[model samples]
Target: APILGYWKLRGLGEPIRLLLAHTGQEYEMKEYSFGPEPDYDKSEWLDEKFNLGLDFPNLPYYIDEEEGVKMTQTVAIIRYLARKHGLVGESDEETIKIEMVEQQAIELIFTCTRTWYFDKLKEEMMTILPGKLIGLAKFLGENQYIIGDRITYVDFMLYSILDYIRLFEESLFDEASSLKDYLTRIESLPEIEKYLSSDDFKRFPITGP
Candidate 1:
């Protein structure tokens, strides 16, 4: 079944698109307008997309045609797709570790999302999020990937998080050599590298100036 969803240039949609592309899922992608007007109104596209409920009332929502389910929240969609597409983890232990790394990446993503506010307040968000990420990086010292030394959802998320930071705040990784290496290794993966170069996997804005 074909997947139908409205897209946005920024915000939570980009990650979902990247995951779908990474998993080589055959699906349809529709990019919505960035102008003031709502280009593709949800109320209008509801029935056509499979009648799946929008529990989150937001864009970047996914409708599984075969399952007849509609859901939002990028993280939820990502985890669901990861497991569905076999990119999550290979075993129980690996799954748990993947979740741990994903959570760490999520924390940093949240920090990047609110960076503008933190900047206005002159608060160094890195002290909180980046410090925690440093701990995670130390935990991953010498490991090629986050879990089981294999690419998983955590890898994509970590790359997204760090890239977001670098795009917004330059030199954010001057002190994170291991994390930098981790991101580089993940991006160098053939599948991930192809996805990163695809038009579908373009970077999103950081929400700050």
Candidate 2:
């Protein structure tokens, strides 16, 4: 399997990378970056897009060469990889619970990606942060992971959102003890801890301009 996207560590590709790391999977990362002056040099991705014969041609795509499976869209790719790697919930009920958490995490990702109104966005995040954190904290009350004892794809999604928030709003978790502890618990996982401290782990700017 190979994960294809931009060179930047941020964006839709990140959660996928985290999931792969958590699952202990070894996959190639084909990253494209911009040229010196301005626009991105996406020719490399464009040239390979048609050859992949995917239904949609887009960045942050994932390909499993042995399975002849290729997909685009961040959520879809995450779900696919999670299912393939046994990172999903065990039962139908548990599956719905995980999906709910995944959706909320996706909302947080979109919220954090807002860069147009920097000050207003920060204000809005502050106002809404407690409600989001409280809800998660309650659900995660005494569980080791979001879905319970086992770490699932939703945990990766939530951790990524929390990490993004920490980049610009380190104080966001001050009022939410459980949520704060949850973030630490996830980060302390042996695989995640190692990855975070590695040279391969790169942080990105707060958001796009």
Candidate 3:
């Protein structure tokens, strides 16, 4: 089985996890944890980071030992699995839309991460996300997924951030009623429902103490 590595939290690794589950790909985990509050030690990962044969070591890596594939970075891993699983768009036009959502959605999750460590970022996030989410709701208007019709890998990308954002800032969706259906559409998938029910992903905090 392939291995998906990350801190023991539902952060950037989540979309990959969602994609894996939705595609029925069984895999292993290489979850690292912080030692304590002040330092939030990462020796657990640092000790093995360079040993993994990764060209650029980082969290949320996907390693398929059988295929001799060791990948770092979130989107790269997503695109790899997408290509392998046939989750990509059928046309150049649809591919353009998927790429658009992929980049935009990653930045949205990045904002959530930056907010955790910086008050300035937190403030900016509080101010900006309402409009951003409203815009997202508009972008996703009348579609079950981001692009439309089918659930592409980018839908996993967009879902992770929207779900993560709502986890912390639930009020942002108060007016984006259409978002309710979009979220539920993904969540209710048989595989995703099974994945979400698992305690491993559900119980972990997004940001460490």
Note the Cα lDDT for every prediction shown. 0.67, 0.78, 0.86
Error at 81, model 2, angstroms: 1.5
Q: Which model scores highest in lDDT?
A: 3
**What's the CA error at residue 160 for candidate 3, in Å?**
1.4
Ten contiguous residues minimizing lDDT sum, candidate 3: 199-208
Greater lDDT among 2 and 3 belongs to 3
**Candidate 2 residue spans exceeding 4 A from truth:** 37-51, 206-209
**Candidate 2, residue 77: lDDT:** 90
Model 3: per-residue Cα lDDT over 1-209, one tens digit each: 89999988877888899999989898998889888779888899999999999999999889998999999989999999999999999999999989988888877877777777476777788888888778878988888788888889998888878887787778878878787789899989999999889866564487677
- Superpose all Cα atoms of candidate 2 onto the true structure and report the RMSD in Å to 1 decimal: 2.3
lDDT of 1 by residue, 37-134 (tens): 54534444453444455666666677776887777777887888888887877778887878887887787767656665445532577456556756
Q: Give the residue spans of candidate 3 off by over 4 A.
A: 118-120
Please write out the lDDT profile of model 2 over residues 84-120, one tens digit for every residue.
Answer: 9999988999999999999988887776666422667
lDDT ranking from best candidate downward: 3, 2, 1
Model 1, position 159, has a per-residue lDDT of 75
